[PDB]
Ligand binder design. Sequence first.
Ligand SMILES: *C(=N)c1nc(OC)cc(OC)n1
Ligand SMILES: *C(=N)c1nc(OC)cc(OC)n1
Lengths: 304, 304
Amino acid sequence: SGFRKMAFPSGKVEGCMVQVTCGTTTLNGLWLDDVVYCPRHVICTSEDMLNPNYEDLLIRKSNHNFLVQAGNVQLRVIGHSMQNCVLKLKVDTANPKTPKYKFVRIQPGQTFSVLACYNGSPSGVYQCAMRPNFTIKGSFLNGSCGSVGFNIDYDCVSFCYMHHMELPTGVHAGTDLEGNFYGPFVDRQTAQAAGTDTTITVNVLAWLYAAVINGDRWFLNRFTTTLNDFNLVAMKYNYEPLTQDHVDILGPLSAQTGIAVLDMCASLKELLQNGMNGRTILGSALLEDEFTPFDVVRQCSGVT
Amino acid sequence: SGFRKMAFPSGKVEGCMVQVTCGTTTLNGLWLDDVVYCPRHVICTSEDMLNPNYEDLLIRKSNHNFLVQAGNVQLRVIGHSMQNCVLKLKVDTANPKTPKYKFVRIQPGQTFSVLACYNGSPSGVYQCAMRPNFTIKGSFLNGSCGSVGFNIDYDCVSFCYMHHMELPTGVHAGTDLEGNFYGPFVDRQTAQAAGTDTTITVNVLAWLYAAVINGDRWFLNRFTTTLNDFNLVAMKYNYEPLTQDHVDILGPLSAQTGIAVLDMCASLKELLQNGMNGRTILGSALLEDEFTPFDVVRQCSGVT
Ligand SMILES: *C(=N)c1nc(OC)cc(OC)n1
Ligand SMILES: *C(=N)c1nc(OC)cc(OC)n1
């Protein structure tokens, strides 16, 4: 029993973190096979960042200008290329600790672990979600760029995020491992405002199922609702609309607890309308939305 | 910017996790050098657990009854001994991945990372604190015993906790790596009720400093208080008394923000008396107490 905001074990990803320096800029790189992936803004000075022409800036860079260090040892760069907003630095040595891996582009609402790094060295691991406005609420200081987000399926690491940027509102933006930003963000120090950060309804419902499984049941009520009635309330509260696909995804948690998905929607509807009244659910005074239904099943079953 | 409940990178500890089986019971062991540490209740059947005499039960066990598996390979047990509530299984092979390590016994209020494991395999990593009533609020299922809590200082892992038990209220109890339980708990399936779970005042104040550093400042007020006046309010709200040692510990965060510790105490006093009024601090609707002042400095500076 007990339910925590849990990150995947980070060891497989720690073995891939390297330091990348270009000129006076140092950030993190991800070393998989004989390629080091890093944000292309490693080539920018703080001034360049205001309006960078990456193709033009990159012309002034050669393989020997990209200093890649893995632990105490230097890696030899034998090629470099730009793919969207990431640089791929081909090195002469395959990473001996390369885990089984995939590059995946996640959808909003999906969660992942972040291994925050500085100078190619891991500092911490935390769990977060791709917000519906394509930002993430991370913990990143200067030098954390190139830190990655990932999920693990037994022994295969699916890398989904690489840190690039902080918006003036303190939220974060980044790319998948193909260098494509999530959302409309660009790697330029310009006015970039995020859209509405709606709540991930399907994740709140999954977390309410985790609460019932772990003994917090005070919020269960005698009501039911329909998808359309629930969605009228969800729109009022800036919650994402619940679809029949979300209901289907919650099927196993509904089966485990015996609480029909629409009944849990009615409990959530009352929590939105009445508030918590100073009460907590799984140690939280707000409705948590950074656990997917898969995360709840995984944590409640103990998948390794 | 941004502030997350962050765990230490788990790789160094993942390299130490093994599976220990005695008869029909399987749990986790911690393999450091040529010793495997595990809860002594590995020798108990579910019936034995009601009133076990460990010394007597242990007489019926030989080295060959302790099956220790590290990954896919079996370790040879060449000795076994009981130290308090842990067993130390001497194996014939030193763990090649043994990190630099220490065994530390933490005080209430101190935080640590837990690498939850099942069958010697890591499932997740999360951050928690030793509560003032000597319980921890973890996420542990059957088979998670022997999972450990730790802190890291650059390359040295300080192991502080080993999971043994869940109380009927869903909170957890365990030992340090010398086998001594935190608090008054025993490794017996008997009526064990936890005392008052007070809030760790010094940690709430540290987290309010992290909120100011990361831009959440709405709760700052025009008031100040004294330790004695603050402590009258802290007692009313089941908060731990703040001492001059806690004030001294918050000195660097006070210096960084320019907010005197007693002024932050006055902000906390008003938050306790007035509530949050539907507002949040660092994404939380309650006052968070599982970040020590050291954690706040570490996360706000990016220590690797
Ligand atoms: C990422 N490491 C990073 N670091 C900065 O300064 C040290 C600035 C920045 O701007 C995008 N990114
Ligand atoms: C710890 N792994 C554990 N597992 C149990 O059943 C599988 C019971 C238990 O009781 C102390 N501990």
